[PDB]
Amino acid sequence: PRNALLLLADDGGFESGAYNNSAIATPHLDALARRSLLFRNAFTSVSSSSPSRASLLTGLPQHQNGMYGLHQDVHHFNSFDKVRSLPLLLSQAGVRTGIIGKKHVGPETVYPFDFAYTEENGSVLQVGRNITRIKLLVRKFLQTQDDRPFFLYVAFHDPHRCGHSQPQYGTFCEKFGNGESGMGRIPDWTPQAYDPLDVLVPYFVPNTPAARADLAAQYTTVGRMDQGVGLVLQELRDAGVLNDTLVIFTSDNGIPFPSGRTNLYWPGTAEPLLVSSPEHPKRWGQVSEAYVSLLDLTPTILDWFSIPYPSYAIFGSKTIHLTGRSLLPALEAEPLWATVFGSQSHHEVTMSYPMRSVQHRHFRLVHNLNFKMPFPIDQDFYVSPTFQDLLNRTTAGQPTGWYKDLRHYYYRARWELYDRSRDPHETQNLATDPRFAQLLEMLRDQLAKWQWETHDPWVCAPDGVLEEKLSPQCQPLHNELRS
Amino acid sequence: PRNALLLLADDGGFESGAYNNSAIATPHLDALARRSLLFRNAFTSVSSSSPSRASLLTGLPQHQNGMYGLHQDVHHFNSFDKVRSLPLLLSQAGVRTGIIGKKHVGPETVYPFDFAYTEENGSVLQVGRNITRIKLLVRKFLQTQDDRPFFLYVAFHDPHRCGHSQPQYGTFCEKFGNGESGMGRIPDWTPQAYDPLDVLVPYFVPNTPAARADLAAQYTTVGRMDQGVGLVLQELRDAGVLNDTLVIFTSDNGIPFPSGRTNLYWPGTAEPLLVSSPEHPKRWGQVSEAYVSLLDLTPTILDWFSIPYPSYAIFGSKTIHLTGRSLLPALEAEPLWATVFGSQSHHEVTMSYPMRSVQHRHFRLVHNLNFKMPFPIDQDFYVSPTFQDLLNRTTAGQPTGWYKDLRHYYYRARWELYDRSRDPHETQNLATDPRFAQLLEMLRDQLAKWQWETHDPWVCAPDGVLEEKLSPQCQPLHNELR
Ligand SMILES: *[C@@H]1O[C@H](CO)[C@@H](O[C@@H]2O[C@H](CO)[C@@H](O)[C@H](O)[C@H]2NC(C)=O)[C@H](O)[C@H]1NC(C)=O
Ligand SMILES: *[C@@H]1O[C@H](CO)[C@@H](O[C@@H]2O[C@H](CO)[C@@H](O)[C@H](O)[C@H]2NC(C)=O)[C@H](O)[C@H]1NC(C)=O
Ligand SMILES: *[C@@H]1O[C@H](CO)[C@@H](O[C@@H]2O[C@H](CO)[C@@H](O)[C@H](O)[C@H]2NC(C)=O)[C@H](O)[C@H]1NC(C)=O
Ligand SMILES: *[C@@H]1O[C@H](CO)[C@@H](O[C@@H]2O[C@H](CO)[C@@H](O)[C@H](O)[C@H]2NC(C)=O)[C@H](O)[C@H]1NC(C)=O
Ligand SMILES: *[C@@H]1O[C@H](CO)[C@@H](O)[C@H](O)[C@H]1NC(C)=O
Ligand SMILES: *[C@@H]1O[C@H](CO)[C@@H](O)[C@H](O)[C@H]1NC(C)=O
Ligand SMILES: *[C@@H]1O[C@H](CO)[C@@H](O)[C@H](O)[C@H]1NC(C)=O
Ligand SMILES: *[C@@H]1O[C@H](CO)[C@@H](O)[C@H](O)[C@H]1NC(C)=O
Ligand SMILES: [Ca+2]
Ligand SMILES: [Ca+2]
Ligand SMILES: [Mg+2]
Ligand SMILES: [Mg+2]
Numbered sequence A: 001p002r003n004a005l006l007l008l009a010d011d012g013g014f015e016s017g018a019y020n021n022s023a024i025a026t027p028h029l030d031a032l033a034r035r036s037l038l039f040r041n042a043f044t045s046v047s048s049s050s051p052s053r054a055s056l057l058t059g060l061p062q063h064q065n066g067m068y069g070l071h072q073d074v075h076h077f078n079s080f081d082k083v084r085s086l087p088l089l090l091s092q093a094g095v096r097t098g099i100i101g102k103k104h105v106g107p108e109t110v111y112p113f114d115f116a117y118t119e120e121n122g123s124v125l126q127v128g129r130n131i132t133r134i135k136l137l138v139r140k141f142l143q144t145q146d147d148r149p150f151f152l153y154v155a156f157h158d159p160h161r162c163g164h165s166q167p168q169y170g171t172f173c174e175k176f177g178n179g180e181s182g183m184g185r186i187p188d189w190t191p192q193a194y195d196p197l198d199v200l201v202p203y204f205v206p207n208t209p210a211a212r213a214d215l216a217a218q219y220t221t222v223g224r225m226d227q228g229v230g231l232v233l234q235e236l237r238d239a240g241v242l243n244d245t246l247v248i249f250t251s252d253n254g255i256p257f258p259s260g261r262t263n264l265y266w267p268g269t270a271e272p273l274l275v276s277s278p279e280h281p282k283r284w285g286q287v288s289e290a291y292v293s294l295l296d297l298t299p300t301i302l303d304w305f306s307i308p309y310p311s312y313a314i315f316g317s318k319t320i321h322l323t324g325r326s327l328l329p330a331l332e333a334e335p336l337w338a339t340v341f342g343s344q345s346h347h348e349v350t351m352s353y354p355m356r357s358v359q360h361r362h363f364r365l366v367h368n369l370n371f372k373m374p375f376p377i378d379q380d381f382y383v384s385p386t387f388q389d390l391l392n393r394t395t396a397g398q399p400t401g402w403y404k405d406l407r408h409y410y411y412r413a414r415w416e417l418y419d420r421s422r423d424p425h426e427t428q429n430l431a432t433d434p435r436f437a438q439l440l441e442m443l444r445d446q447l448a449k450w451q452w453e454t455h456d457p458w459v460c461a462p463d464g465v466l467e468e469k470l471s472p473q474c475q476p477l478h479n480e481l482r483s
Numbered sequence B: 001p002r003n004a005l006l007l008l009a010d011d012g013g014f015e016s017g018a019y020n021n022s023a024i025a026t027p028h029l030d031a032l033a034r035r036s037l038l039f040r041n042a043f044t045s046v047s048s049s050s051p052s053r054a055s056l057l058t059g060l061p062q063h064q065n066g067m068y069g070l071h072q073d074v075h076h077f078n079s080f081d082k083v084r085s086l087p088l089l090l091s092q093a094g095v096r097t098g099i100i101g102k103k104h105v106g107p108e109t110v111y112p113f114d115f116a117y118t119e120e121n122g123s124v125l126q127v128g129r130n131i132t133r134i135k136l137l138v139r140k141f142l143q144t145q146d147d148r149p150f151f152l153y154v155a156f157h158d159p160h161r162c163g164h165s166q167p168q169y170g171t172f173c174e175k176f177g178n179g180e181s182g183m184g185r186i187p188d189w190t191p192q193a194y195d196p197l198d199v200l201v202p203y204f205v206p207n208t209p210a211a212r213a214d215l216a217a218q219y220t221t222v223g224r225m226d227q228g229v230g231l232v233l234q235e236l237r238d239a240g241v242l243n244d245t246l247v248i249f250t251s252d253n254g255i256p257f258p259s260g261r262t263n264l265y266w267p268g269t270a271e272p273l274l275v276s277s278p279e280h281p282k283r284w285g286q287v288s289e290a291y292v293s294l295l296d297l298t299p300t301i302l303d304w305f306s307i308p309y310p311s312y313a314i315f316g317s318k319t320i321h322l323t324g325r326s327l328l329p330a331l332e333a334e335p336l337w338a339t340v341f342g343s344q345s346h347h348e349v350t351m352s353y354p355m356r357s358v359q360h361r362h363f364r365l366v367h368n369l370n371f372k373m374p375f376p377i378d379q380d381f382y383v384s385p386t387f388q389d390l391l392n393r394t395t396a397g398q399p400t401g402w403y404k405d406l407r408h409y410y411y412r413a414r415w416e417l418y419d420r421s422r423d424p425h426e427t428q429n430l431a432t433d434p435r436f437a438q439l440l441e442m443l444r445d446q447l448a449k450w451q452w453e454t455h456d457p458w459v460c461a462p463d464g465v466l467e468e469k470l471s472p473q474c475q476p477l478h479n480e481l482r
Helices: A027-033 A049-056 A086-092 A124-129 A131-143 A209-238 A294-304 A385-396 A406-410 A434-453 B027-034 B049-058 B086-092 B124-128 B131-143 B209-238 B294-304 B385-396 B406-410 B434-453
Strands: A003-009 A037-039 A096-101 A115-118 A150-155 A245-251 A273-276 A286-288 A339-346 A352-360 A363-368 A415-419 A464-466 A474-476 B003-009 B037-043 B096-101 B115-118 B150-155 B245-251 B273-276 B286-293 B339-346 B352-360 B363-368 B415-419 B464-466 B474-476
Touching (some): A086 A096, A096 A131, A131 A209, A245 A294, A339 A434, A385 A406, A415 A434, B003 B294, B027 B209, B049 B086, B086 B096, B086 B294, B096 B131, B131 B150, B245 B294, B415 B434
Parallel strands (some): A037 A286, B003 B150, B003 B245, B037 B286, B096 B115
Antiparallel strands (some): A037 A273, A339 A352, A363 A415, B037 B273, B339 B352, B464 B474
8 A cells, every 4th residue: 555654843944954954963854855856945835833734734724724823722723623634534535544743733523533642642742752752653553554554644843942831951842851860861862962153043043142052952953853753764664664655744834033933934934845755766866946835735645545635615615625736746747836825814812913925936925914013923932042132132222133123023014025036035125116016916916816716714804804795805994004 | 499591682782761762662671671670881891792692601701711703604713612601500500501592602512501592503593583483492491391490591683783694684684574575474573663763873873864774774673672582581471480580681792883893982892781680679670880791690690599600720720710790789789889891802803903991980991902903894894884874975075974983993092091971972082191190000900900810811912922931921022012
């Protein structure tokens, strides 16, 4: 049988040898990249953990699958009951399904796995960060195979921050299991220490000692994640199935630094993506330039198992259709895929800053539906040494070392248009430039067509109201906003 | 031998003889008022159907029970799994529970009823608006009583709008069951027609021909609701249990007109409230001046059945405690209750305009957490003839007959302070008046203390961030908000 393994880092970026970062040591991801197609232009559709995971596992944008924000405690979003997720369709077609690590989506009836070791039924630390334990669970999973195909989803909790939840293990949990007093030992992990001066400060991160100490800790933890990818792959090799298994490696959202996680800017939505098919070796070790979305993974995995997406409606007779496509053709030839979309509504339930985006190659358009209010900041990020330092400096009147200032981080234009080929840092908004008005109209039109097609309840916001029974279906509010 | 009946109108206001509206015919609500304490100053804590129903049935504000907006389809809010609602606690203590009508809350595990006829398992029209059907189901319920006390919740769908959902029955479904072609017959209902010139136009509603035709249809439907209250009470009398039954009549939110439903203004949150205890006749037919909240119903009903509220946490070890109180002492003496709170986060999921409020007697303070954006407008209200007419006129530059203009309806101050004893229409904002600063501080403070005490996730918004492990727990964002 064909099997499939999805490896997902949490808040992972491009800190790998495979993405040309020579400061970090990620031998196992580098070895995987040599047996993979590597995508330079992959994007998540949403820069929020639960919406991202839900969109990845359904192939529907968050506005359509119902996970409008975080899933846990107080935030409490869940996808619609009638949604047919990837693991549900795979089970119905006879594929054995497993998840180890952070799930962070619900309800269980929409995202059922036959074998499930997650934060719901055990320690996130043990099933998300202790790579020895993850190794042992992957082994248990493989040893209980029954000649059905399998789909195994390994959702690492590394390299997510711990400053909010678990401060004594350090800002990225880099001290958990490192064998120092009070930390325990993860016997399969060799900790890699980084000096703050050795890290690459990305362009959107302030270059200060506090941010550098933050990145050094992240690097150690990306290291633990990389070793975990090694262990997992080694278990599939020991069980003799690796050579029958599609391996995909990605991350759910951008790194938890300014302009990253929670933004539809490039740093918040750009994701590493490796795809390794044992049946398509032609392109192993090559780099694709095609513009692809995490919305493509569900149709890629259904394609691999030859399972159709069924025609159904979640509500009324609004039939659901996937807007992503299978990546499997890209394994044989380089395609001209150019367009990716973004949709975000909430992160935390108190953070209502809906954003819609479309990218056409190096051009990116963001629409900020709630732009008159300041951009909200999540609680986990707020206590980061990086945010603290930026805030402390901004208020004390000192230089921040940052490529923006807070005021403009908080108060954004309704429309932001950027050309990354000329302006890769996305600091020159072109939506106000009359030379770019025909492009701006072309992009707004594509984004709107996608919004309708995916049944976006925010399609008419903020200037209008959706009224499905009349033509035109967006009706004006005359609320002093552009229409 | 105590039982309890809760009668809840949907979007009902003060269109009754009991509230001295002389234009409408509500004989059955009037008769009930004669055997009740009537509250002049009762308020819902939230002006949205599912949040209101959830808060009423739990005694927790919406920000604490998890029903942050509407429950149905795309909006999809549910209360937290570990919440102990009124019907759950009543069942655990041995009280048989029933619901007939519009439930509009979830999940079923948090709001379980032994006998249940709702939108979940049948037509909302039949179990919410067809009073004959409702009469027959209350009869079935009573005929199947056993050893036990009962709690029966009858949640009428009248007088809610039908313009959005069910247009062919008229703007308030006033033609459904009226015996005309295509409409069917509700044999127990006598339809009452109103001329648009006979209705009372409330102060917050434009006095125009379109709005008057809108109110005339509402009146016919308030009439059907009143007749349904009559039938329900008559079934309890026929079964011989009315005299053992606490009857409460209220509504979930203000009327679906401008400044009403979805606002924390007086018109959106003020509710009719009748309480009739067969064991406390001293104040039957009287009017209380005490300021009370629909957050008080759950503790009132638990008090009636002598059931404690248990000590539990929904999350971690943040123990839940009710902030409302029992209304039963008010049946014996007039109390000095002065303070009522309001909390709204969403209505529709696309309508994020969180509002927090506190009222101290005739003073009201509203805090609009998202004030720099325009106030959103729900889809059902937008197609009302009343909103259409106001929008069309505003757009065409014609006089609106309205006490506000749209611009100021859309763009509100962060803090709105009003004194209804001098300014009942709430059009003179006093929050910027330095003479009123000490009162403004006193009220902000009370509202903040309630927010913490009820575990409000928005307690630090919009200028700060909640960080539970540091002191102070609200941490500043320096985002140009004061
Ligand atoms: C990570 O998980 C592994 C395996 O569960 C833990 O190692 C175990 O430690 C216990 C207690 O000392 C022993 O009884 C087991 O036999 C150990 N197993 C192995 C394979 O070593 C390890 O302690 C965990 N590390 C952390 C930091 O939690
Ligand atoms: C690993 O998997 C590949 C792909 O399934 C195997 O290579 C195929 O082997 C078959 C034998 O039935 C040939 O006819 C195919 O042409 C091969 N295809 C490709 C694309 O390589 C391979 O045998 C497997 N085993 C090892 C050790 O590599
Ligand atoms: C309102 O409810 C009553 C009771 O369900 C409906 O009357 C019943 O209608 C069915 C189907 O026509 C008959 O079989 C029953 O005999 C009727 N029962 C009674 C007591 O009359 C009535 O049709 C419903 N009205 C509307 C307008 O929907
Ligand atoms: C209706 O209810 C009231 C209150 O339960 C009953 O009045 C009580 O009568 C009983 C028995 O005589 C006594 O416990 C109390 O002294 C009375 N209290 C009050 C306030 O009246 C009355 O019995 C009931 N009527 C019927 C027909 O049963
Ligand atoms: C890394 O460097 C090489 C040579 O400069 C280039 O061809 C490759 O595409 C780069 N990698 C990525 C991930 O962009
Ligand atoms: C910033 O200032 C706060 C406020 O006193 C202080 O406690 C914190 O330790 C500082 N953090 C950084 C990164 O400067
Ligand atoms: C209505 O007016 C009557 C007679 O003037 C009075 O007794 C009663 O208090 C009033 N009802 C209300 C609800 O104010
Ligand atoms: C509002 O405007 C539209 C368009 O002119 C018109 O057809 C409709 O009847 C108007 N409605 C009201 C209530 O004025
Ligand atoms: Ca994440
Ligand atoms: Ca209502
Ligand atoms: Mg009973
Ligand atoms: Mg006007």
